[PDB]
């Protein structure tokens, strides 16, 4: 099953302040109006990179497991959440379909309905990347249209080969970046406050 | 002006020769609060290094580095680089670094080369021919040695083959020296592969321990995790400088900013791409790095035949930057305010004009658009010409160029 | 700011002067266009005290001693007509003010003193009295003024007002001076953008190249962004001296119009503005000119039978000035540009032999005065 | 070697020929505006205000002059003005007289 | 429309989209000028039988 993204999934596409402005970029970006998958679970393939989305209560979801192998041989990489910060591991274990109870060889280590979190990862070659938002709104499972930009968390200078994800265990949403231009509006106070899906209609283009 | 104009003759009027450029008035630096140094003094100070056939390797990542801070001391018994020079070392960036750590007696220290063959070198620690890196070795008789010998320090003297660039291995096997079945166990030519040194405190120099630590270097496809040090300077103000943030070089007036950066923005941009302001890492504080001024500069003068003093316009410059007169079209220089309004002689800009004039000088002025009249208009009042004069107007226009051709082959090649 | 690229760029020779001295004439030409536009002038006429102009009413167009010291209509337009790495800027020689007396004086000398201030000292006339020489210099004869003073002036007044309200209601009017702003405002920003092209060298941030290379490699590398950065300016270059050119044919045609509509009363049909022209008020605009064209135009016509001719005692009668018409039932003779009947006499008309040469004439009386 | 003595050099020329394409242009414009003054300024008299030289004009003659041509344009200026009081009409008769 | 080529020809940068607004440019003006030439005419006036 599917849902409309409307304008969601921009984030900040580098570490620039602009102010009063309109700046165009290619990168890897969800595209406006995108078909989300619905949710309210299994393994799902990454492609080039993913957008993650969820309307918990109280910051539910546990974590996330991304790699090649899920499974041993290498390190996956691992990502964990404790109240409103964040666990990150790369390991090669080898669990069964339950591994937030199964809980090394790893060579990586780091620490950190009423609300809605969204999350962009990202492979960049250039090592890999995280951006996130929070928001409240209301009380509805459907993603309510709406502007906002996913800024940087965090850069992993790892090195993980990623084609998977799973996620550890309300509504949730995953999509795909795509390589497309974007226009982005810039306030004054440096902040991404409107966008064009350059590609997305004749008007638009 | 006369070489500008390529001529000994200066006919009158204004003429640029020059920019110019205000200079940088000093070099600033700013990177991060010094952290994350790596941890090479951590190995170095660790309470014993191992068995050279087993010897320690530490790998290190994430960190900047500063490998003088290590060969900078006389303290050690030598240090040593191959390959490259110790200072350079402070340059560098790489995805992986090692310190590799061992016991040697004071003799066979020398099997610590490129290329070496013996014991050490063979069995224990292979360093290639083209090795890149540094060895640090000092004394230890009296952290190692113990009385009837220590033995927590062996070589493997005996080995199947030669070990491959900077391996390690674990690997031991009975040394059979002639005829006997070895198979094994210890005996009559079936050596012991794990020999000591047997270390003892009255040893003289070449028997007695000396501890060493080895630093190997990688760069990879995967990018560097280590890198040198993240140099700064003073932060002067209100100035044009030279500059440096975070590797974004360049020159500039560095000034204070309200520029509301988010807490992840490093540099700022104007609507043309250009650059405006940045973060200093060192503080909160966003600096708006206006352009350095400069303008060009033009030379006024009358014509060389009737007098050879000139004038000076610096364009668009304020005279705090450069007798004088500040313009809206920049500073007048060697030129007279006199502001009394005139024809305008020579051309500058913004309502000014200047002229040589008499006790002679150069003045510059605001020109006079010709006489005020006021006409004497009112509802019933008429002015008639009582009489005329006929008169002869030259106009002068051009209609040909010189015919001119060129052969393209002939001027290109010939 | 790099010595290693400067002394490479000397191997281009001449280039990077040659481009600086065509953008010097082109700047230079800027002043030549604004001097032969406005400064035609001799001497700067001023306004007298009591507006007395016969009734109508030009406060909109003369300045305003209480505000630059403009008009109201240029103020207008100088209110809807709406970076610096190694590119200047350089000011205008007569700025905006200077402009605005050469536009007050050419204003006021077309006011107190119709064409004589352009052809000679100004000469005073009544507004009242230039306005009739105007109209007969369109073929309707003077009393036609002087019978409809009132209506004309209100006619006059009324048509500033709209313009005043014209201006004042859209930006969109303006277009051939905002597109003036425009195109150099898109040209100087390409210039500009065109540094941070690489040219497929291995970086356009220059630094890059003089701190990671080898100078057996770096020169290979800065000559590709010199090649880059040197054909941007020569399009730049060429482009601006076509655009000089284009203004240029547009200042000869705005210097033109100054002479004629202005200083002058032109009888070149559908030059200074649509309709039989009667005089122009030039206004100052940013980057240009403004021309208030004031223009007769006939309005409320009326069908008649005509002859080419009259006949009278045999001899054939053709109208002096005017055009021969009737109601149906008597002749009359009209200036050809206003109706207004003249009973036929000998001295509107003059004789050209016999009533057989002319095709379609007709009788009718000739009354000898 | 050579390519980059041709690269330079043929630059160089399309440069020249570029500005000199410019630059006749300008002068086809100043030929065209002598014509035109020719025409009306010699062989006519110009009704076209400071067109043919300032004051009314009355007649040019054309003089060559080595790459272009002069024109003398000879004009008529008024110069020795008096006041007078004037009026716009004059009754006779309740009728009303004009000039 | 060989993709090897279109990739290098990014990087020359503004050339090959200025290009276009300047033929652009030119392309306009020919309907101005055709434009300006005949309708001068208020309205389409058509002769008598
Ligand atoms: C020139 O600079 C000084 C010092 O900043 C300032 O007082 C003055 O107002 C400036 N004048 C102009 C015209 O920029
Ligand atoms: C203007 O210049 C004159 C001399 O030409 C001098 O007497 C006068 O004081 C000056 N006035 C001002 C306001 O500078
Ligand atoms: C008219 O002016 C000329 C000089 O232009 C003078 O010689 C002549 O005497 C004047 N005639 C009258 C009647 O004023
Ligand atoms: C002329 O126009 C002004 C407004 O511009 C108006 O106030 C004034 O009453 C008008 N009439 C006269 C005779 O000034
Ligand atoms: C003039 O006469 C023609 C033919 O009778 C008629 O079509 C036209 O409407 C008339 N125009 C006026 C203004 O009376
Ligand atoms: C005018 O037109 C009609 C039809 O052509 C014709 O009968 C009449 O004789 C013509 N009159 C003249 C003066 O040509
Ligand atoms: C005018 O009147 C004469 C007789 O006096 C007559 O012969 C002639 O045909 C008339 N002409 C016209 C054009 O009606
Ligand atoms: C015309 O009369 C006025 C007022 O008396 C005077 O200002 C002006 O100078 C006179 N002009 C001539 C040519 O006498």
Same mark, same amino acid.
């Given at each position: 099953?599917?849902?409309?993204?409307?304008?969601?999934?921009?984030?900040?596409?580098?570490?620039?302040?602009?102010?009063?402005?309109?700046?165009?970029?290619?990168?890897?970006?969800?595209?406006?109006?995108?078909?989300?998958?619905?949710?309210?679970?299994?393994?799902?393939?990454?492609?080039?990179?993913?957008?993650?989305?969820?309307?918990?209560?109280?910051?539910?979801?546990?974590?996330?497991?991304?790699?090649?192998?899920?499974?041993?041989?290498?390190?996956?990489?691992?990502?964990?959440?404790?109240?409103?910060?964040?666990?990150?591991?790369?390991?090669?274990?080898?669990?069964?379909?339950?591994?937030?109870?199964?809980?090394?060889?790893?060579?990586?280590?780091?620490?950190?309905?009423?609300?809605?979190?969204?999350?962009?990862?990202?492979?960049?070659?250039?090592?890999?990347?995280?951006?996130?938002?929070?928001?409240?709104?209301?009380?509805?499972?459907?993603?309510?249209?709406?502007?906002?930009?996913?800024?940087?968390?965090?850069?992993?200078?790892?090195?993980?080969?990623?084609?998977?994800?799973?996620?550890?265990?309300?509504?949730?949403?995953?999509?795909?970046?795509?390589?497309?231009?974007?226009?982005?509006?810039?306030?004054?106070?440096?902040?991404?406050?409107?966008?064009?899906?350059?590609?997305?209609?004749?008007?638009?283009? | 002006?006369?070489?500008?104009?390529?001529?000994?003759?200066?006919?009158?009027?204004?003429?640029?020769?020059?920019?110019?450029?205000?200079?940088?008035?000093?070099?600033?630096?700013?990177?991060?609060?010094?952290?994350?140094?790596?941890?090479?003094?951590?190995?170095?100070?660790?309470?014993?290094?191992? *068995?050279?056939?087993?010897?320690?390797?530490?790998?290190?990542?994430?960190?900047?580095?500063?490998?003088?801070?290590?060969?900078?001391?006389?303290?050690?018994?030598?240090?040593?680089?191959?390959?490259?020079?110790?200072?350079?070392?402070?340059?560098?960036?790489?995805?992986?670094?090692?310190?590799? *750590?061992?016991?040697?007696?004071?003799?066979?220290?020398?099997?610590?080369?490129?290329?070496?063959?013996?014991?050490?070198?063979?069995?224990?620690?292979?360093?290639?021919?083209?090795?890149?890196?540094?060895?640090?070795?000092?004394?230890?008789?009296?952290?190692?040695?113990?009385?009837?010998?220590?033995?927590?320090?062996?070589?493997?003297?005996?080995?199947? *083959?030669?070990?491959?660039?900077?391996?390690?291995?674990?690997?031991?096997?009975?040394?059979?020296?002639?005829?006997?079945?070895?198979?094994?166990?210890?005996?009559?030519?079936?050596?012991?592969?794990?020999?000591?040194?047997?270390?003892?405190?009255?040893?003289?120099?070449?028997?007695?321990?000396?501890?060493?630590?080895?630093?190997?270097?990688?760069?990879?496809?995967?990018?560097?995790?280590?890198?040198?040090?993240?140099?700064?300077?003073?932060?002067?103000?209100?100035?044009?400088?030279?500059?440096?943030?975070?590797?974004?070089?360049?020159?500039?007036?560095?000034?204070?900013?309200?520029?509301?950066?988010?807490?992840?923005?490093?540099?700022?941009?104007?609507?043309?791409?250009?650059?405006?302001?940045?973060?200093?890492?060192?503080?909160?504080?966003?600096?708006?790095?206006?352009?350095?001024?400069?303008?060009?500069?033009?030379?006024?003068?009358?014509?060389?035949?009737?007098?050879?003093?000139?004038?000076?316009?610096?364009?668009?410059?304020?005279?705090?930057?450069?007798?004088?007169?500040?313009?809206?079209?920049?500073?007048?220089?060697?030129?007279?305010?006199?502001?009394?309004?005139?024809?305008?002689?020579?051309?500058?800009?913004?309502?000014?004009?200047?002229?040589?004039?008499?006790?002679? *000088?150069?003045?510059?002025?605001?020109?006079?658009?010709?006489?005020?009249?006021?006409?004497?208009?009112?509802?019933?009042?008429?002015?008639?010409?009582?009489?005329?004069?006929?008169?002869?107007?030259?106009?002068?226009?051009?209609?040909?160029?010189?015919?001119?051709?060129?052969?393209?082959?002939?001027?290109?090649?010939? | 700011?790099?010595?290693?690229?400067?002394?490479?760029?000397?191997?281009?020779?001449?280039?990077?002067?040659?481009?600086?001295?065509?953008?010097?004439?082109?700047?230079?030409?800027?002043?030549?266009?604004?001097?032969?536009?406005?400064?035609?002038?001799?001497?700067?006429?001023?306004?007298?005290?009591?507006?007395?102009?016969?009734?109508?009413?030009?406060?909109?167009?003369?300045?305003?001693?209480?505000?630059?010291?403009?008009?109201?209509?240029?103020?207008?337009?100088?209110?809807?007509?709406?970076?610096?790495?190694?590119?200047?800027?350089?000011?205008?020689?007569?700025?905006?003010?200077?402009?605005?007396?050469?536009?007050?004086?050419?204003?006021?000398?077309?006011?107190?003193?119709?064409?004589?201030?352009?052809?000679?000292?100004?000469?005073?006339?009544?507004?009242?009295?230039?306005?009739?020489?105007?109209?007969?210099?369109?073929?309707?004869?003077?009393?036609?003024?002087?019978?409809?003073?009132?209506?004309?002036?209100?006619?006059?007044?009324?048509?500033?007002?709209?313009?005043?309200?014209?201006?004042?209601?859209?930006?969109?009017?303006?277009?051939?001076?905002?597109?003036?702003?425009?195109?150099?405002?898109?040209?100087?920003?390409?210039?500009?953008?065109?540094?941070?092209?690489?040219?497929?060298?291995?970086?356009?941030?220059?630094?890059?190249?003089?701190?990671?290379?080898?100078?057996?490699?770096?020169?290979?590398?800065?000559?590709?962004?010199?090649?880059?950065?040197?054909?941007?300016?020569?399009?730049?270059?060429?482009?601006?001296?076509?655009?000089?050119?284009?203004?240029?044919?547009?200042?000869?045609?705005?210097?033109?119009?100054?002479?004629?509509?202005?200083?002058?009363?032109?009888?070149?049909?559908?030059?200074?503005?649509?309709?039989?022209?009667?005089?122009?008020?030039?206004?100052?605009?940013?980057?240009?000119?403004?021309?208030?064209?004031?223009?007769?135009?006939?309005?409320?016509?009326?069908?008649?039978?005509?002859?080419?001719?009259?006949?009278?005692?045999?001899?054939?009668?053709?109208?002096?000035?005017?055009?021969?018409?009737?109601?149906?039932?008597?002749?009359?003779?009209?200036?050809?540009?206003?109706?207004?009947?003249?009973?036929?006499?000998?001295?509107?008309?003059?004789?050209?032999?016999?009533?057989?040469?002319?095709?379609?004439?007709?009788?009718?009386?000739?009354?000898?005065?």
């Amino acid at each position: 099953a599917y849902t409309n993204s409307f304008t969601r999934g921009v984030y900040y596409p580098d570490k620039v302040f602009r102010s009063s402005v309109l700046h165009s970029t290619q990168d890897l970006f969800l595209p406006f109006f995108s078909n989300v998958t619905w949710f309210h679970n299994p393994v799902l393939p990454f492609n080039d990179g993913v957008y993650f989305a969820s309307t918990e209560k109280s910051n539910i979801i546990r974590g996330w497991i991304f790699g090649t192998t899920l499974d041993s041989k290498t390190q996956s990489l691992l990502i964990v959440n404790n109240a409103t910060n964040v666990v990150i591991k790369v390991c090669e274990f080898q669990f069964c379909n339950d591994p937030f109870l199964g809980v090394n060889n790893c060579t990586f280590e780091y620490v950190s309905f009423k609300n809605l979190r969204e999350f962009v990862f990202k492979n960049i070659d250039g090592y890999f990347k995280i951006y996130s938002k929070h928001t409240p709104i209301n009380l509805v499972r459907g993603l309510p249209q709406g502007f906002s930009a996913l800024e940087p968390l965090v850069d992993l200078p790892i090195g993980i080969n990623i084609t998977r994800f799973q996620t550890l265990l309300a509504a949730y949403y995953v999509g795909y970046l795509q390589p497309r231009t974007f226009l982005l509006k810039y306030n004054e106070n440096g902040t991404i406050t409107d966008a064009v899906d350059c590609a997305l209609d004749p008007l638009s283009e | 002006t006369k070489c500008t104009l390529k001529s000994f003759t200066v006919e009158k009027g204004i003429y640029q020769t020059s920019n110019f450029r205000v200079q940088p008035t000093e070099s600033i630096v700013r990177f991060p609060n010094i952290t994350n140094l790596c941890p090479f003094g951590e190995v170095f100070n660790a309470t014993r290094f191992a *068995s050279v056939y087993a010897w320690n390797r530490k790998r290190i990542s994430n960190c900047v580095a500063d490998y003088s801070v290590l060969y900078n001391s006389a303290s050690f018994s030598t240090f040593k680089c191959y390959g490259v020079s110790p200072t350079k070392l402070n340059d560098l960036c790489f995805t992986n670094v090692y310190a590799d *750590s061992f016991v040697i007696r004071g003799d066979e220290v020398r099997q610590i080369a490129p290329g070496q063959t013996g014991n050490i070198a063979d069995y224990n620690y292979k360093l290639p021919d083209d090795f890149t890196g540094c060895v640090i070795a000092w004394n230890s008789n009296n952290l190692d040695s113990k009385v009837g010998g220590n033995y927590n320090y062996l070589y493997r003297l005996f080995r199947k *083959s030669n070990l491959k660039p900077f391996e390690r291995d674990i690997s031991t096997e009975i040394y059979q020296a002639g005829s006997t079945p070895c198979n094994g166990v210890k005996g009559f030519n079936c050596y012991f592969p794990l020999q000591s040194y047997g270390f003892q405190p009255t040893y003289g120099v070449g028997y007695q321990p000396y501890r060493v630590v080895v630093l190997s270097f990688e760069l990879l496809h995967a990018p560097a995790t280590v890198c040198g040090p993240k140099k700064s300077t003073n932060l002067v103000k209100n100035k044009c400088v030279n500059f440096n943030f975070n590797g974004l070089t360049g020159t500039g007036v560095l000034t204070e900013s309200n520029k509301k950066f988010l807490p992840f923005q490093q540099f700022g941009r104007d609507i043309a791409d250009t650059t405006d302001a940045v973060r200093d890492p060192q503080t909160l504080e966003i600096l708006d790095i206006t352009p350095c001024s400069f303008g060009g500069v033009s030379v006024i003068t009358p014509g060389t035949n009737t007098s050879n003093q000139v004038a000076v316009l610096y364009q668009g410059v304020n005279c705090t930057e450069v007798n004088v007169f500040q313009t809206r079209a920049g500073c007048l220089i060697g030129a007279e305010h006199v502001n009394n309004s005139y024809e305008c002689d020579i051309p500058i800009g913004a309502g000014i004009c200047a002229s040589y004039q008499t006790s002679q *000088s150069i003045i510059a002025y605001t020109m006079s658009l010709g006489v005020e009249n006021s006409v004497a208009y009112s509802n019933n009042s008429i002015a008639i010409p009582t009489n005329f004069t006929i008169s002869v107007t030259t106009e002068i226009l051009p209609v040909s160029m010189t015919k001119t051709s060129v052969d393209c082959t002939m001027y290109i090649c010939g | 700011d790099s010595t290693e690229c400067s002394n490479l760029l000397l191997q281009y020779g001449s280039f990077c002067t040659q481009l600086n001295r065509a953008l010097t004439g082109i700047a230079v030409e800027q002043d030549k266009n604004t001097q032969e536009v406005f400064a035609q002038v001799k001497q700067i006429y001023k306004t007298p005290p009591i507006k007395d102009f016969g009734g109508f009413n030009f406060s909109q167009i003369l300045p305003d001693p209480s505000k630059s010291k403009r008009s109201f209509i240029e103020d207008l337009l100088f209110n809807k007509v709406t970076k610096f790495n190694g590119l200047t800027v350089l000011p205008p020689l007569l700025t905006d003010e200077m402009i605005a007396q050469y536009t007050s004086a050419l204003l006021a000398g077309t006011i107190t003193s119709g064409w004589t201030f352009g052809a000679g000292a100004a000469l005073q006339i009544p507004f009242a009295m230039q306005m009739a020489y105007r109209f007969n210099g369109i073929g309707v004869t003077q009393n036609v003024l002087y019978e409809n003073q009132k209506l004309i002036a209100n006619q006059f007044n009324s048509a500033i007002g709209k313009i005043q309200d014209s201006l004042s209601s859209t930006a969109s009017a303006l277009g051939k001076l905002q597109d003036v702003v425009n195109q150099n405002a898109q040209a100087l920003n390409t210039l500009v953008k065109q540094l941070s092209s690489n040219f497929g060298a291995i970086s356009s941030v220059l630094n890059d190249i003089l701190s990671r290379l080898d100078k057996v490699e770096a020169e290979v590398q800065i000559d590709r962004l010199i090649t880059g950065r040197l054909q941007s300016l020569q399009t730049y270059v060429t482009q601006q001296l076509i655009r000089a050119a284009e203004i240029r044919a547009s200042a000869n045609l705005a210097a033109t119009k100054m002479s004629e509509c202005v200083l002058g009363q032109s009888k070149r049909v559908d030059f200074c503005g649509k309709g039989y022209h009667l005089m122009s008020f030039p206004q100052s605009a940013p980057h240009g000119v403004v021309f208030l064209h004031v223009t007769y135009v006939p309005a409320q016509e009326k069908n008649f039978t005509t002859a080419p001719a009259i006949c009278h005692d045999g001899k054939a009668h053709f109208p002096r000035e005017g055009v021969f018409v009737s109601n149906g039932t008597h002749w009359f003779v009209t200036q050809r540009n206003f109706y207004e009947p003249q009973i036929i006499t000998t001295d509107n008309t003059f004789v050209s032999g016999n009533c057989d040469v002319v095709i379609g004439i007709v009788n009718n009386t000739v009354y000898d005065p």
